[PDB]
Design a protein around this ligand. Sequence first.
Ligand SMILES: O=C(O)CNC(=O)C(=O)O
Ligand SMILES: [Mg+2]
Ligand code: NI
Ligand SMILES: [Zn+2]
Length: 331
Amino acid sequence: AQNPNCNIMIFHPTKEEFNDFDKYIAYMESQGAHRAGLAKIIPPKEWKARETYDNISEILIATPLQQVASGRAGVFTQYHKKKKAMTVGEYRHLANSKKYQTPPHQNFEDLERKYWKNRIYNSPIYGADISGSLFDENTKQWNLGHLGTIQDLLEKECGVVIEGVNTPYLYFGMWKTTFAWHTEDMDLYSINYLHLGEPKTWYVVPPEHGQRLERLARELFPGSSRGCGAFLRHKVALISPTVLKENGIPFNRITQEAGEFMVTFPYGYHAGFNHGFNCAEAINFATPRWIDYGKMASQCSCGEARVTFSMDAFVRILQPERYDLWKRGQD
Ligand SMILES: O=C(O)CNC(=O)C(=O)O
Ligand SMILES: [Mg+2]
Ligand code: NI
Ligand SMILES: [Zn+2]
C-alpha cells in the first residue's frame, strides 16, 4: 500500500506531465497521495496562470463576510456577517490597514502560533465564493475554468445525463481569514490555486479517519450535533491542532504559497487560514474513484447548509433514498 502513514505529498510535474490533468491525478493516486486527503502540486517552471495580476482591482466583492468567532481559542465557531460591497482594490487596502494586517512574526510557525492564540479576538473580512476565474484563456494546462465537468464524469461513468454546471470560485483573503472544517459537497475533490499574495495554511484529516474527526466534533459542539446529523456541512466549526493532538485525531498540515496548487481528495476533511492579503481560485471536480464516495456522502437536511443548483442531480441520482428529505432541507 503506497503512503501508508497518509503524509501530504508534494509533486513537481514536468511541462510534459502537466498536459493531461486526469492522467496526472491518477498518477498521484498511484503513489498514494489521496491517503493524506490533500496534495500539493508545484507547476513546471515554464507554466504561468496569466501574464500579470496588474489589472484585478476592479473585481467586485459583492458580499464581503466578517468572520465573527464564538468559543475558546482552540474550539470555536464562526458566523459570517454580511458587509457592504467593495472592490478588490478597496479590500486589499483594508487587508493592509493597521487593524487587519499580518503582525510581525519570525516564520510560518510563529505566525501559526499567533493565529491559534489570537484568532477568536478578531473578526477578519473574507471575500469568498465569488464566481469567476483569473486564468488566462490561453493557459491550456491546469486551467481551472477548462476542466472536464462533474456532470460529464457522471455521464461517462454511469450513463445518465443530468442538468447542472460546474464553474470556479475566487477567494480574496486577509490575515486570520478562516476556512472551517469540512469536506466538499458530495465528498468531491477540490483543486485550489493560490494566484497571488500571502500564504494559506491547511490542516487535513486522512479520508480513512474522517469519522474520528466527526466523533470529536459531535463531542465538542454538542448542541450543533443535536441540531443536525451532518453539521460540519455548515462550514462553521474550528478545532486547533493542539486540540486534535490532545484527542488523538490523525492529521497533517502544510502551507501553500502563491503559484502552487492544492488538491483535496474525496472525504478529506480540511480547514485553514490565510496569512495576509491573497487571492485563490478553486473548483470541485470528480474522477471515477469519486463515485463511490458520492454515493455515501452525508447530507445536511436541517436546512442550514443550503448549496448549489447542481448538487440536486447528484443527490437525485446517487442517493435516491435521501433525495426527498434532502430537498425538503433545500426548500
Ligand atoms: O481557500 C479557501 O478559503 C477554502 N478552499 C477550500 O476549502 C478548497 O479549495 O477546497
Ligand atoms: Mg479589475
Ligand atoms: Ni474545501
Ligand atoms: Zn444541517
